Design a protein around this ligand. Structure first.
Ligand code: VQW
Ligand code: ZN
Length: 258
């Protein structure tokens, strides 16, 4: 009886195995745009993905992960609210059964069709496993998806999903350039939070871009053809793999922009 997104194992159950689910810095949150204060001390985001080396794509039974070779200092996030350098290890998405839901963060209670998470670890902790034990161990770049024009830079991801339909399936996925998934503007909100799945560790500096990317209805429909189940198990479509907004508690959301 493992955690997931259903009635019996979904986000409202996670606190039983992971009591930090009710902690002081949980993610995601609603971003109240009128309460988020412009912080003129914040720096422009530095996103350096020119040398990013993708290796593989994996259906882990909750989402699909595009994994990067993080054995060298190549694809790095720095600046913005960050001290030091954070190395890209993977990206994944959260999405809905319908276009009106699927994002984890919300903006004035607005839900987007999906949300992209580019996960980076603080190189001062040497490896990802040590970094998730630290309050400043991870930086996750969050990007909203709305349904409209196709995102050409996403299509290589969409086209491989047929080959990883079920939990535990992986496919070679080399030479994928994640610069193709970024919006024009790097205007962002930032706050201290957590992983949004178990183990819900409070180790993340969240950086959520204001500008969504547009994907086509056909692109997001192919996300919704994936399966939570393993091969030869009853089909459970991989949809609504998002955690709802959590209490902001004693936290401030800061804006990089006026
Ligand atoms: C390897 C670490 C330790 C651990 O137990 C893992 C496997 C839980 C699942 C984690 C993964 C790290 C990368 C991802 C971060 C994501 O968080 S998010 N949604 O806030 O970007 C939760 C999903 C994710 C695959 C964790
Ligand atoms: Zn995520």
């Amino acid at each position: 009886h493992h955690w997931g997104y259903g009635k019996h194992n979904g986000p409202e159950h996670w606190h039983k195995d992971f009591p930090i689910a009710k902690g002081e810095r949980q993610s995601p949150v609603d971003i109240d745009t009128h309460t988020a204060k412009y912080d003129p001390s914040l720096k422009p985001l530095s996103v350096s993905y020119d040398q990013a080396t993708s290796l593989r794509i994996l259906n882990n039974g909750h989402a699909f992960n595009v994994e990067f070779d993080d054995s060298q200092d190549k694809a790095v996030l720095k600046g913005g609210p960050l001290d030091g350098t954070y190395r890209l290890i993977q990206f994944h998405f959260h999405w809905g059964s319908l276009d009106g839901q699927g994002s984890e963060h919300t903006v004035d209670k607005k839900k987007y069709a999906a949300e992209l998470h580019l996960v980076h670890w603080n190189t001062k902790y040497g490896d990802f496993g040590k970094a998730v034990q630290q309050p400043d161990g991870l930086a996750v770049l969050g990007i909203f998806l709305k349904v409209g024009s196709a995102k050409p830079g996403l299509q290589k991801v969409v086209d491989v999903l047929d080959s990883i339909k079920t939990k535990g399936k992986s496919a070679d996925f080399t030479n994928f350039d994640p610069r193709g998934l970024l919006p024009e503007s790097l205007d962002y909100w930032t706050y201290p939070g957590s992983l949004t799945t178990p183990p819900l560790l409070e180790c993340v500096t969240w950086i959520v871009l204001k500008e969504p990317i547009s994907v086509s209805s056909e692109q997001v429909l192919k996300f919704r053809k994936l399966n939570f189940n393993g091969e030869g198990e009853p089909e459970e479509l991989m949809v609504d793999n998002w955690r709802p907004a959590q209490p902001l508690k004693n936290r401030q959301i800061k804006a990089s922009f006026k």
